[PDB]
Amino acid sequence: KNNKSWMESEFRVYSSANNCTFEYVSQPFLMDLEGKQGNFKNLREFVF
Amino acid sequence: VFNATRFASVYAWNRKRISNCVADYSVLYNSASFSTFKCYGVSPTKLN
C-alpha cells in the first residue's frame, strides 16, 4: 500500500530448534525486495 | 567462559560445545593467572 516496506514480516521457515552444533552470520547489508516489471534482470547459479 | 558472571552448580554442570573457531592457548596456559593447572594423557605444550 503506502509505505511500500517490502521487508520480512512473518517467519514460517521452521517451528522450533533445540540443539545447534554450528552457526555462521555474515555482515549487515540491504537487499532490494521491491518488485520489478519486464524481463529477468538477475541470474544466480549455485553448486553444493 | 572462565570469567562469566555466574557458573552452574556442580550437579548441574553445563556442557558447552565449542566449534567453528580458533583456540589460542598461549594466553591461557602460559599466563600463570590460575592457582593450579594439570593435564591428563597429553602435556600442555603438545596440545598447542
Give the whole-angstrom CA distance, residue A35 versus residue A42.
13
Residues of A with CB under 8 A from a CB of B: 21-24
- Residues of A within 8 A of B21 (CB-CB) are none
Q: To one decimal place, what's the resolution in Å?
A: 4.5
- Residues of B within 8 A of A21 (CB-CB) are 17, 19
Provide Rg for chain B, Cα atoms. 13
Helix (H, G, I), strand (E, B) or coil at B46: helix
How is residue B23 written as a grid cell? 583456540
Give the whole-angstrom CA distance, residue B46 versus residue B48.
5
Residue type, B32: A
How close B22 comes to chain A (CA, Å)? 14
Contact B19, A23 (CB under 8 A): no
Contacts of B7 (CB under 8 A, 6+ apart): B14
